[PDB]
């Protein structure tokens, strides 16, 4: 089964955000230099690239049903571009501080942004990008936001305050706050996508990855072996693996039942910052962004 092949890797300035298009063979990268790139990874030619700002662009996602990309940067701004025409759809100050993470609701016209200003904000693109809600409660930088794909009326925020908070749209306090015991904070949070386990996963500067049952709040497992900050850890949408990446320069693939490491990849691009998985498992593609560029891998 596991048969990793290097589909396309290119050098660039540090890749902070990365995302797959669901129906075109494209990957978006958002760089520390303010540039973003959309690559066709099958032909190895750029679809479109934009010098968005001079500040780091830490977050970026496709919104394929609108033909957009949405990005967020340290100059405080969210910007949306039509990837077919290059048109800048909107450009607004979202937070008075860095933007760490953006999530897009799977069906509704909502975007979440998580920020160093201690908040998550919800924006509605059918209401002229209005701020519809600010979720307050975290006490340090909000590093990651993610909808629960099985119930996207709720979402998780991971924060340097050592907690994950799970919230309901339209309600002002968390449904619960998860004390992770990851004392250097939480850099990333992700949901297992399938209905048989109510699992979430967190990654930390404390070198650990933890699996949580979000119904009981118990820690199911702690995955150890990275040697520097763990930037992300995710469940794959079709394969029984977890994929993590670290400032130690490695990606790690772990068995999602036994929680034992299956493969460590020394990609050769220095520190790893971000991850994406092809949302339908096409060619088992994954992509990760690093200090010195990105790589698109086929797992099988």
């Amino acid at each position: 089964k596991l048969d990793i092949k290097k589909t396309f890797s290119n050098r660039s300035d540090r890749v902070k955000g990365i995302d797959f298009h669901p129906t075109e063979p494209w990957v978006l990268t958002t760089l520390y230099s303010g540039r973003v790139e959309i690559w066709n990874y099958e032909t190895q030619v750029e679809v479109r690239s934009i010098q968005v700002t001079e500040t780091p662009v830490r977050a970026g996602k496709f919104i394929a049903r609108k033909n957009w990309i949405i990005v967020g940067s340290d100059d405080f701004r969210i910007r949306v571009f039509n990837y077919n025409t290059g048109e800048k759809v909107v450009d607004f100050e979202a937070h008075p501080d860095y933007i760490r993470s953006i999530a897009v609701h799977p069906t509704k016209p909502y975007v979440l942004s998580g920020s160093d200003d201690l908040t998550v904000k919800l924006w509605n693109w059918e209401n002229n990008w209005a701020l519809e809600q600010t979720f307050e409660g975290h006490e340090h930088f909000v590093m990651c936001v993610a909808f629960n794909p099985k119930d996207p009326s709720t979402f998780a925020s991971g924060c340097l305050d050592r907690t994950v908070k799970v919230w309901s749209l339209g309600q002002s306090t968390p449904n619960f706050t998860l004390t992770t015991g990851q004392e250097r904070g939480v850099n990333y949070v992700d949901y297992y996508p399938l209905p048989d386990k109510p699992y979430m996963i967190t990654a930390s500067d404390d070198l650990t990855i933890k699996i949580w049952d979000y119904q009981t709040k118990s820690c199911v497992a702690t995955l150890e072996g990275h040697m520097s900050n763990v930037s992300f850890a995710v469940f794959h949408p079709t394969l029984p693996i977890i994929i993590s990446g670290s400032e130690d320069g490695t990606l790690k693939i772990w068995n999602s039942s036994t929680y034992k490491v299956e493969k460590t990849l020394n990609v050769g691009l220095e520190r790893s910052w971000c991850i994406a998985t092809h949302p339908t498992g096409r060619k088992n593609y994954i992509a990760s962004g690093f200090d010195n560029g990105f790589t698109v891998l086929s797992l099988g």
Binding site: R14, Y32, Y98, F141, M143, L160, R271
Partner: peptide
């Protein structure tokens, strides 16, 4: 001032 996680 950015207290941490500037990279």
């Amino acid at each position: 001032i950015k207290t941490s996680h500037d990279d």
